[PDB]
Design a protein around this ligand. Structure first.
Ligand SMILES: Nc1ncc(C(=O)N(Cc2ccccc2)Cc2ccccc2)o1
Ligand SMILES: [Cl-]
Length: 445
């Protein structure tokens, strides 16, 4: 087992990782900004290192500082969590070049998945179903581009290769808008990603967002751990996630899961990863892969019993997966509600000091958060301050438990989305299940 690791993150995920480390007897180093001295996981860590002032650029994105902290403490590995540097291939490369273990895939794999065009080509080659599309970057020849659009059939969508997570894309419904749409997506991609490469896909009007969790070790084992529906979202920000995905049969699960695990083997994948699909009219279409552990991982843990962070750490130490595919069984149902410090009317971040706090409890209730009474939510970081995950023997029990748990949750002193989450749990279409990626925005409007 890894002797000591740096937790190169903050907030709830840093605490999640610290818990996994403690369970495994791994020493912890909490690197933190000067604004984050009183984070729960910082206070629980074996060693702490202040790596910079509040703004992320000089702390949680500060590569030299994070690597120096690993050097000075005698740490052997760095877990990037999610966000920040978790999908930064150059960081992963520098970490490994510096002699430390990066808890993630090989840097080349991170780079591959960060290049949406090359990722699609790799997945398509491996036998994973992808969205009908250009199968390559679009050039400047608008006769050729119209031809590609005709072949796919309108509506189409132009996406940035260096983009992802719903960012850097626009829908085109005919020839008249194609040139300008490509031109604009390209300009925006160059500005945001210093990469003006773009591609085309068939636009799917009302899909669900369904993603498959995988784990792969360095011994050649690769497994899938069912799926998550993350369709309840607002402006490419997930709000509620659940597992398994309603209406997905064990036969479909098996079909798509096996293809994802096959692709892992083909590409030499290692660690945790997520294959994102659009799911419409009973069909899966791969859009992108994430190499990090994600915010929504806990719902998968609840329905499979696999501790995904512990598996990450085991894999990095050179241990094989703790479970075989024939041992993975979907049992019950789990729902996650993200808890955000945000104003209900503007949806802008609402930082400040928490004056009263109470967490829910009971059977099937899991609360993932660093917050406590008297804790100040800083303005410098993301608005998500916690995750409430409820598990049941079925979806209706999970939802019932979530409603009860949301009613117990007290967070005074700041504005939160608890009321919104209660409305979602009480929503009759959500209660039916299978609502699409556009539902929440329509409901709110
Ligand atoms: N081929 C294709 N059709 C649609 C999409 C898409 O990626 N998105 C982005 C997205 C996916 C999942 C959750 C939230 C957003 C759907 C989309 C794209 C552009 C405008 C509205 C929705 O891709
Ligand atoms: Cl994530």
């Amino acid at each position: 087992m890894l002797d000591k690791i740096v937790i190169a993150n903050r907030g709830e995920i840093a605490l999640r990782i610290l818990r996994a480390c403690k369970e495994l007897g791994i020493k912890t180093v909490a690197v933190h900004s000067s604004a984050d001295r009183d984070l729960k996981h910082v206070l629980l860590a074996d060693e702490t290192v202040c790596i910079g002032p509040a703004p992320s650029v000089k702390s949680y994105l500060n590569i030299p500082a994070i690597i120096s902290a690993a050097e000075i403490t005698g740490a052997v590995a760095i877990h990037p969590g999610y966000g920040f540097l978790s999908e930064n291939a150059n960081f992963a490369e520098q970490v490994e070049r510096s002699g430390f273990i990066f808890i993630g895939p090989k840097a080349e794999t991170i780079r591959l998945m960060g290049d949406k065009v090359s990722a699609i080509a790799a997945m398509k080659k491996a036998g994973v179903p992808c969205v009908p599309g250009s199968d390559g970057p679009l050039g400047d020849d608008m006769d050729k581009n119209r031809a590609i659009a005709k072949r796919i059939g309108y509506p189409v969508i132009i996406k940035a290769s260096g983009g992802g997570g719903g960012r850097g894309m626009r829908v085109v419904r005919g020839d008249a808008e194609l040139a300008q749409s490509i031109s604009m997506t390209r300009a925006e991609a160059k500005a945001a990603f210093s990469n003006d490469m773009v591609y085309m896909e068939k636009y799917l009007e009302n899909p669900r967002h369904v993603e498959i969790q995988v784990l792969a070790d360095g011994q050649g084992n690769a497994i899938y751990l069912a799926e998550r529906d993350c369709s309840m979202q607002r402006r490419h920000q997930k709000v509620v996630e659940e597992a398994p995905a309603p209406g997905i049969t064990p036969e479909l699960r098996r079909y798509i899961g096996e293809r994802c695990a096959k692709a892992c083997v083909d590409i030499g994948y290692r660690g945790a990863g997520t294959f994102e699909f659009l799911f419409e009219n009973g069909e899966f279409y791969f859009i992108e892969m994430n190499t990090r552990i994600q915010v929504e991982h806990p719902v998968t843990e609840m329905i499979t019993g696999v501790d995904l962070i512990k598996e990450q750490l085991r894999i990095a130490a050179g241990q094989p997966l703790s479970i075989k595919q024939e041992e993975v069984h979907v049992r019950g149902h789990a729902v996650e509600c993200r808890i955000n410090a945000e104003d209900p009317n503007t949806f802008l971040p609402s930082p400040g000091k928490i004056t009263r706090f109470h967490a829910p409890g009971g059977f099937g209730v899991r609360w993932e958060s660093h917050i406590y009474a008297g804790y100040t939510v800083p303005p410098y970081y993301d608005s998500m301050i916690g995750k409430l995950i409820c598990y049941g023997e079925n979806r209706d029990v999970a939802i019932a438990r979530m409603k009860n748990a949301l009613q117990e949750l007290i967070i005074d002193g700041i504005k939160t989305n608890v009321d919104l989450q209660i409305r979602i749990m009480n929503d009759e279409n959500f209660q039916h299940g299978g609502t699409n990626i556009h539902y929440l925005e329509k409901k709110l409007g």
